Amino acid sequence: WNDGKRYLWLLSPFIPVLGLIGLGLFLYTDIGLFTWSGPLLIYGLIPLLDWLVGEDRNNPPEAAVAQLENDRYYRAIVYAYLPTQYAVTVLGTWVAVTADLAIWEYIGLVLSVGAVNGIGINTAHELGHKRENLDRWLAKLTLAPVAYGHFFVEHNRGHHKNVATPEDPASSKMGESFWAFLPRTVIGSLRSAWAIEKARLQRNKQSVWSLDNENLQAWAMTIVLFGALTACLGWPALLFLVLQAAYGASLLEVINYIEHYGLLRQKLPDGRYERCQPRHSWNSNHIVTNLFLYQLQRHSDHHANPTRRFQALRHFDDSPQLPSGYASMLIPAYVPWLWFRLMDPLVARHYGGDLTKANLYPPKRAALLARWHRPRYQCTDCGYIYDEAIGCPREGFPPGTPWSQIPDDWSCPDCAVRDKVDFRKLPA
Ligand SMILES: CCCCCCCCCCCC
Ligand SMILES: [Fe+3]
Ligand SMILES: [Fe+3]
Ligand SMILES: [Fe+3]
């Protein structure tokens, strides 16, 4: 079974090359428009190829899935992204602090570098799920230029666990404007990351202000990079880096807004939420954007099986579908009323006119209800095996720890989507 779209994945590592070409053209021909090579590319060009080329509801055969995850080329693709984002950042900073510029082209440079680092954040997300030790460090390195390093902890252990619940500071509520959502998600991510790492360290009988704190390990790389650039160039370099990092963080947060807008997970008869399923996240199958990003828009199979590699994701008929691709709907997300008009009918239709099973904004509940309501152990998902003789030293359990001493709320440390009570006791 020939994959077909094998070499077409190369567009994903090609975006930083596009930014580099734009910077080179600006430096050579001295034309201002070439600075805006990022905003134009991700606002007018991509949501034009997305219109030209339609859907694709295709899945790999089950037999071929075994060998798709053992191909080194699909990992070389992701690895190739790294040694061009740093080049783009360095060149952009040098140009912004050295060459004479007007205000608007300075803004264009900021936006271009920020966009490159936002797709860098996407690559970091793709890298941080793999259980290989080297990939975690590579993801931490990738998150450095955008200065948002706590993502590696938060996404892996507080978002994938609290999907589509009124507690997660990463799931939208229907009726909530984006600008009323950005501070909430940013602050909640900070607090949750700090709390998670402090809890783990305290369980390990060690102070939070230690070199083992992964948040500090992630932020040290950003501190080092920014300090080196500032020492080489000066304060304007620091200002430019701060602005571009802010824009990249905004780019990540708008996608977080889009993914799970309005959905909700139903409580089990006992006091816990049901396991995450493909019907708890929006999905789309637009070819061009799924090529420029690493199969990102299929945020159902990944977000219910957070170990399948990006080349083996599937399409599920039960999931809700977006009107278009992600890049197609970024302008109709900064504008609140337009986004509401586009989305609210779709949510109501998906829930069959019964909006008592939706994540409703508390201040706007009554209006929406008036307008729309017309009625040895193993993990069963990722295969991780816990052995009493080996134990889990990272989580604070020394070797020789009987299964009874594990807390009931403990979750699988490869996927964090199954609790202790969901494991299966393997036979001797
Ligand atoms: C939850 C996965 C994070 C995805 C990060 C992508 C952010 C950049 C997307 C830009 C699309 C135009
Ligand atoms: Fe998500
Ligand atoms: Fe993920
Ligand atoms: Fe697991």
Residue numbers in the entry: 13 to 387, 415 to 467
Verbatim from the authors:
Alkane monooxygenase (AlkB) is a widely occurring integral membrane metalloenzyme that catalyzes the initial step in the functionalization of recalcitrant alkanes with high terminal selectivity. AlkB enables diverse microorganisms to use alkanes as their sole carbon and energy source. Alkane monooxygenase (AlkB) is a transmembrane metalloenzyme that catalyzes terminal hydroxylation reactions of alkanes with broad chain-length specificity and exclusive terminal C–H bond selectivity. AlkG, an [Fe–4S] rubredoxin, docks via electrostatic interactions and sequentially transfers electrons to the diiron center.
Here we present the 48.6-kDa cryo‐electron microscopy structure of a natural fusion from Fontimonas thermophila between AlkB and its electron donor AlkG at 2.76 Å resolution. The solved FtAlkBG structure is a monomer, consisting of both AlkB (residues 13–387) and AlkG (residues 415–467) domains, with a total molecular mass of 48.6 kDa. The FtAlkB structure is mostly α-helical, with six transmembrane α-helices (TM1–6), two partially membrane-embedded short α-helices α2 and α3, a long membrane-associated amphiphilic helix α4 and six other α-helices outside the membrane. The diiron center is coordinated by nine conserved histidines and one carboxylate residue with His137, His141, His167, His172 and His314 coordinating Fe1 and four histidines (His171, His272, His311 and His315) and glutamate Glu271 coordinating Fe2. Additional density was present in the active site of the cryo-EM structure, allowing a dodecane substrate (C-12) to be modeled with its terminal methyl group in close proximity of the diiron center. The linear dodecane is oriented by hydrophobic residues, such that its terminal methyl group (C(sp3)–H bonds) is 5.3 Å from Fe1 and 4.8 Å from Fe2. The proximity of the substrate terminal methyl group to Fe2 suggests the Fe2 center may be more directly involved in C–H bond activation. FtAlkBG has a long, hydrophobic substrate binding channel starting from near the middle of transmembrane helices TM1 and TM2 and ending at the diiron center. FtAlkG sits on a positively charged surface of FtAlkB, adjacent to the diiron center. Although there are two irons in FtAlkB, the [Fe–4S] cluster in FtAlkG is closer to Fe1, that is, at 13.6 Å, than to Fe2, at 17.1 Å.
